[PDB]
Amino acid sequence: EIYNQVNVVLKDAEGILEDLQSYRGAGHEIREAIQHPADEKLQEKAWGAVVPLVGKLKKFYEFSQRLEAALRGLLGALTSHLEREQALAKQFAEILHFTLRFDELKMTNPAIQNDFSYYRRTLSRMRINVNNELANRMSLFYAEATPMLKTLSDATTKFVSENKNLPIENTTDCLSTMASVCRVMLETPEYRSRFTNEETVSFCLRVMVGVIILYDHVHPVGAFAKTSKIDMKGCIKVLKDQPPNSVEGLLNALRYTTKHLNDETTSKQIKSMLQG
Amino acid sequence: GSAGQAIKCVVVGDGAVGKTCLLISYTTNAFPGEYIPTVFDNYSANVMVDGKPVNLGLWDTAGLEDYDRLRPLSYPQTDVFLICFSLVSPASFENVRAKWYPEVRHHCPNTPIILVGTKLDLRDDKDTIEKLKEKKLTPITYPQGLAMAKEIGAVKYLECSALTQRGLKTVFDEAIRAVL
Ligand SMILES: Nc1nc2c(ncn2[C@@H]2O[C@H](COP(=O)(O)OP(=O)(O)NP(=O)(O)O)[C@@H](O)[C@H]2O)c(=O)[nH]1
């Protein structure tokens, strides 16, 4: 499946950020090695220190290429009725969440480019008496202030540029609608006081079920129908992820305050909602 | 020391003018006596200029004539250019008006230029000045450097030494000040 293609690479995302934060570098060993070129004993300590760091930098770069390939593979499936387009929006939010941290840590860490530059500077020296083509791409990767954002933006623009028949809106709509719903969740009006972190998450669950029930009543086909925009099966699963004590009020509300739940057309898998 | 303004700064100039050394001397406060050519390299440093934080992205380029087709791929989205020539090498000093100004303008015509004079410590050295005599040559003096900067339309002419670090800090500070 190419729908959990981005989720498969994100498995190691926590490990990448954890390794990137712990990346102290080897600026001290590199510096003293340059200060005393002739000291071969000190050149070994510097070179020996660099190997570990480069291997992690290659591990970080290769991750961005897999994440790039996974994102384009995800956008590729867009092309090919009953389009599950939440995958696009869900995985966009997930990789962007990771992307902001990766860029933030790299941004404020000049040791990364320092180490790398030394590494390829001492390869040449060693040329006198990793893959070379890969190293050049890696050099250009870490040269940027925001490598991941640059990689994502380039990858998405590469997709739309070689899919000109599809308008920019198709792919950029999810990105603009997500920012408006977030504002709805996070924005606090004048009439009431600001919600807590517990209330905003609670609120978010209520509106989700709230708009579904109101949509079910006003929209002809409803929220339960096979040819619906709601995709409830997924919305109920999110509710049953939550503690049983929490969301019982919302869970019940769907059971008896809907319109097209009990009608014949509704799936019997959706009806699987009991309580004791 | 958190995140700052991302300012890209590409350094161009011939081989052995001191492009790589003045970047390594600035960021790491170390001077490599060993000479190894660099096709392309990059460094960075979080610095404070005029009370504003800056993540100064430094792009080191090749000086050799064999990397003319490969050098200009690092040019796009440049905020400032450092055309570096050695003060102890007239050839390099003319290559400024002959090649670099044409080249950097050709790709990025609206991006500022900072004309930098490298190896300032060698201009007043018997050993180094006798060899210029030997090769029938007179070191590029300040008036010449400034006159050249005025011709190419560089916003500032600076002269510094990567070894002594005399006016090394001022070059990058002025490089940032041009993009604020
Ligand atoms: N005395 C002195 N030597 C310097 C100075 N700056 C650089 N050098 C010397 O210049 C040589 C290397 O210059 P470098 O910075 O590598 O030149 P480059 O601009 O990188 N040339 P390339 O395009 O080939 O990479 C070394 O011998 C180094 O010690 C300086 O200010 N003073």
Ligand SMILES: [Mg+2]
């Ligand atoms: Mg160099």
